[PDB]
Amino acid sequence: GSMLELPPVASLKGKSITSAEQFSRADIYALIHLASAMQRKIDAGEVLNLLQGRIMTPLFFEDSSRTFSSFCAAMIRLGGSVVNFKVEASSINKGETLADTIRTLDSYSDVLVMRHPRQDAIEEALSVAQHPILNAGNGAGEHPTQALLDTLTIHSELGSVDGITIALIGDLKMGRTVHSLLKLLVRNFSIKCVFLVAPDALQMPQDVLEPLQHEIATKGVIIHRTHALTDEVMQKSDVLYTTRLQDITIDAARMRLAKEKMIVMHPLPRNDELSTTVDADPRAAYFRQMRYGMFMRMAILWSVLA
Amino acid sequence: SMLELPPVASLKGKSITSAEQFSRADIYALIHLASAMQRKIDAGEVLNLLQGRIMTPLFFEDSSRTFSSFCAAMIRLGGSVVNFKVEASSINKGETLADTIRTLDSYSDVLVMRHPRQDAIEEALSVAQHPILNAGNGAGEHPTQALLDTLTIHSELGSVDGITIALIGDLKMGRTVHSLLKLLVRNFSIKCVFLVAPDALQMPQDVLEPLQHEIATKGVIIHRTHALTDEVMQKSDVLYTTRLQADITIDAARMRLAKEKMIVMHPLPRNDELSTTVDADPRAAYFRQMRYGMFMRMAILWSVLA
Amino acid sequence: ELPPVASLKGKSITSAEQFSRADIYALIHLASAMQRKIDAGEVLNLLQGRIMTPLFFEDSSRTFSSFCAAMIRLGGSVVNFKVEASSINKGETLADTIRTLDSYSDVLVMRHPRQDAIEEALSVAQHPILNAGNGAGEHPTQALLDTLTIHSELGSVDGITIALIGDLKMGRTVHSLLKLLVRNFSIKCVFLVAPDALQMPQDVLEPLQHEIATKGVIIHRTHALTDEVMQKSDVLYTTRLQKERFTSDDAAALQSFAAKADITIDAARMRLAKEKMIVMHPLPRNDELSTTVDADPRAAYFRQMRYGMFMRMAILWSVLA
Numbered sequence A: 001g002s003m004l005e006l007p008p009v010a011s012l013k014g015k016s017i018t019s020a021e022q023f024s025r026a027d028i029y030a031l032i033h034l035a036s037a038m039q040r041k042i043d044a045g046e047v048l049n050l051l052q053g054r055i056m057t058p059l060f061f062e063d064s065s066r067t068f069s070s071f072c073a074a075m076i077r078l079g080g081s082v083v084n085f086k087v088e089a090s091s092i093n094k095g096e097t098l099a100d101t102i103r104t105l106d107s108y109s110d111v112l113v114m115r116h117p118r119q120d121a122i123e124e125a126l127s128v129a130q131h132p133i134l135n136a137g138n139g140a141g142e143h144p145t146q147a148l149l150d151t152l153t154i155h156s157e158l159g160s161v162d163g164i165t166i167a168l169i170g171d172l173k174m175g176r177t178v179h180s181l182l183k184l185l186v187r188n189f190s191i192k193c194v195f196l197v198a199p200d201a202l203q204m205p206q207d208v209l210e211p212l213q214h215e216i217a218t219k220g221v222i223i224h225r226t227h228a229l230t231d232e233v234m235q236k237s238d239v240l241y242t243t244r245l246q247d248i249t250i251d252a253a254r255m256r257l258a259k260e261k262m263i264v265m266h267p268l269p270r271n272d273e274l275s276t277t278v279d280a281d282p283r284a285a286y287f288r289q290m291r292y293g294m295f296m297r298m299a300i301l302w303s304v305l306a
Numbered sequence B: 001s002m003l004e005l006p007p008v009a010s011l012k013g014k015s016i017t018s019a020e021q022f023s024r025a026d027i028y029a030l031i032h033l034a035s036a037m038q039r040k041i042d043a044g045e046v047l048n049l050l051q052g053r054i055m056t057p058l059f060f061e062d063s064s065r066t067f068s069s070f071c072a073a074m075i076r077l078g079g080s081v082v083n084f085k086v087e088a089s090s091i092n093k094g095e096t097l098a099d100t101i102r103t104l105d106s107y108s109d110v111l112v113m114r115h116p117r118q119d120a121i122e123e124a125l126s127v128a129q130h131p132i133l134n135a136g137n138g139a140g141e142h143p144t145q146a147l148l149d150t151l152t153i154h155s156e157l158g159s160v161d162g163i164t165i166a167l168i169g170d171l172k173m174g175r176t177v178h179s180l181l182k183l184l185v186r187n188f189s190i191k192c193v194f195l196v197a198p199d200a201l202q203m204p205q206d207v208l209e210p211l212q213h214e215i216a217t218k219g220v221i222i223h224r225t226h227a228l229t230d231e232v233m234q235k236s237d238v239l240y241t242t243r244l245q246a247d248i249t250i251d252a253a254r255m256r257l258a259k260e261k262m263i264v265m266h267p268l269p270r271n272d273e274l275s276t277t278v279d280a281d282p283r284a285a286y287f288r289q290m291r292y293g294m295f296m297r298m299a300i301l302w303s304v305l306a
Numbered sequence C: 001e002l003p004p005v006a007s008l009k010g011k012s013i014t015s016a017e018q019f020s021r022a023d024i025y026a027l028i029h030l031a032s033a034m035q036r037k038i039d040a041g042e043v044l045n046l047l048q049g050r051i052m053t054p055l056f057f058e059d060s061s062r063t064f065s066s067f068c069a070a071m072i073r074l075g076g077s078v079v080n081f082k083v084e085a086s087s088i089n090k091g092e093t094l095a096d097t098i099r100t101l102d103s104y105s106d107v108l109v110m111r112h113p114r115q116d117a118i119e120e121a122l123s124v125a126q127h128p129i130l131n132a133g134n135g136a137g138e139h140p141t142q143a144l145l146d147t148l149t150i151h152s153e154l155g156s157v158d159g160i161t162i163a164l165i166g167d168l169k170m171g172r173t174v175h176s177l178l179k180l181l182v183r184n185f186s187i188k189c190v191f192l193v194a195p196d197a198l199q200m201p202q203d204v205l206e207p208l209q210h211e212i213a214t215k216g217v218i219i220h221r222t223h224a225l226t227d228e229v230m231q232k233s234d235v236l237y238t239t240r241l242q243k244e245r246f247t248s249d250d251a252a253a254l255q256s257f258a259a260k261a262d263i264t265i266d267a268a269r270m271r272l273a274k275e276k277m278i279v280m281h282p283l284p285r286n287d288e289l290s291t292t293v294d295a296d297p298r299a300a301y302f303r304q305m306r307y308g309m310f311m312r313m314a315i316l317w318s319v320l321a
């Protein structure tokens, strides 16, 4: 993988990342090819020193296993460093405001990775930070880097993103991952069809679907709402993208209905909506998805900080 | 390297426990080293001075600035951090402080220690082979805060001799003001100090009494006030305020009385004693102060470890 | 100058049993070489771009810090994963957690209160896992650094008389150490010094019974540091009461440590010890090992931690080379 270039995606330079809306099709493909090259070099055991002396600081005001770790791992595999700030062992116990906390980490860091239970917290953070903030999840709003890594996953596993039928399953109302993913897919690709699979109370919100209306109509994207993984959903979907609470269960029995050429995805963590009986299936892409996450995050950090 | 970033020789291999241990020449050499670190980092240069050396933080109480600042400064020097947490440690199995110290001392080149007991630093020093840097010992001292505070004054105003400074808030329990008063009065010709606090929270007699010889021979003027009077507002070149862990609040209305060229400083975190209405004022130096902190800690770490 | 121990390459470390004598000596010599270079101030860049992720489900000072420090001094990096701040709060299983960190890491360092958690991790992990403690089971890298300590301090492991003292029932350190010494060395004598309720378990001794017999290793049980134990032992290896592993059963076991044994090591007790010997303790200690011993040249339990770092460098390099 030695002779591969790592050209940073120029449109990302020095910018905060808050929404799937900010990326073009050209941006997404450029990040995919960058991530794929990162992967090749890392897997061949090559050592990258692109971000030596640059600091990422995680600011996680709620729990994370993969997003936090993969961001740290991505930064370190670029040669960068991480300052391990913790909210519970911080001056927030002494009454410190969110804005003062941002200005603090912003004094030391080159990039901030922020996850917060309030949707409006990223906005507040942007209004005071000088360095880029990467949105690692803002309440029930968005998770833009999850959308990007999810798209890398589809592209690598199936070989194409245009033309797919995808089911978004579970808690679509509160799921920030399905919010960013729908936006990123519909805005930039020629999606055939989207099944919105959720109980009525947990359906995809209007504030996501409405801004997409022009794109949905002009590209002819077929939207279908169901409250179950029906035979039709199982038989037509190239991607079953399921999510946690926050019948739609996927187990081996259910998988007998799926196409040979398809993938099951889940941003994780999972509960019983996605059974361990699916794990040995070649079509279970939800573990590989995490490793794709680290490479996408390397492509993003290098592009942001180059 | 020895030209651009000469280490301050007097600090080599030494523990830092008190503002008292520094001379005027030490402070100026640190200040000049910190500005050179600043210039190199802000120009994007990568420093490799402490590769292979380990700092370990030992924080028995919370910190946002001091912990992060020290970690960043170590990293920006090319050194590394072992992220020890007291709450996830063998202290829960009955391990003493002395044994904890010997433990981290077996792996580390420098320890950074914050503890709610004033004498805990002295116990740690009796067993440690490697330097310990006091990041706060009860209501005792915070010597690196006084150093970065003095760098902040020097950089913003252009000199430290001749200033009128107000120390405002909980002066009794404020380890920052204890160290700062000591550092300033011992080593500079301070014109006037205002100690702005009710008698119940006034500067301790055990800080004032040992400064007797320097107050006398440099003719430093010192007055107590209970409130932030108009005289204090009009005469002060530096308003240094702190968390009362009446009538001491600095807001945009109070600022209308301040000199045109002065700074407002605060070691942080703040409560209502320092209104956010002041944050847009160019005189508000308490965010820049944190960044000076990182460069001062780089100058300290490099001098101690070179 | 720092050749990795080839037999360890790419392999998980779960038990003292997986090591041969040649493996132990090659690790010791590699560890001593790491120590010479680190002490001379040399900077190593052997694992640049490799990541270790600590997965600690219980408390640690030495083991966690030592592994991180060892990784760093090899030029490697750490992803500081925190169990209490993870998706485990949202219901994520152990296996899914393992798969997660395994997606980003080159090596996992795992400590868990359940003895069988390490095996479950192994069945799903692609990258090597290092057992940093599995319940009251084993602490294999402790056993290695302890043998490094005995070797460096006394100059020989074969022929020693060793007392294993304290909570032998819940002591994963003495479990691993007893297995490592007996399988790979000609130990002259082992004193098992504990109250009956905390004695070395049968599931440790029985698999060792063949080696004990055919090597002629003397095993004695006592509940006290008698004159005989003090006068004959080349090493006194003492341990903490493992309270966190402990009903009236529990209460009986817990108080037996002071009530049904006489096993404190203090300066007065040390007046009976040989001139050429060491006192060891994996740490942390409570009152079983008095601070009056710390000034004694024979107190090796602080130097033991530093040997720990060098053994862990030799191990990490050997696993990841």
Ligand SMILES: N[C@@H](CC(=O)O)C(=O)O
Pocket (backbone or CB within 6 Å): A137, A143, A176, A177, A243, A244, A267, A268, A269, A270
């Ligand atoms: N972990 C993802 C989805 C989930 O929580 O299941 C998120 O934080 O958005």
Ligand SMILES: N[C@@H](CC(=O)O)C(=O)O
Pocket (backbone or CB within 6 Å): B136, B142, B175, B176, B242, B243, B267, B268, B269
């Ligand atoms: N945080 C600083 C100052 C303050 O608490 O106001 C200290 O810990 O000393």
Ligand SMILES: N[C@@H](CC(=O)O)C(=O)O
Pocket (backbone or CB within 6 Å): C133, C139, C172, C173, C239, C240, C282, C283, C284
């Ligand atoms: N720290 C060692 C010994 C002890 O805990 O007492 C262990 O974890 O096994």
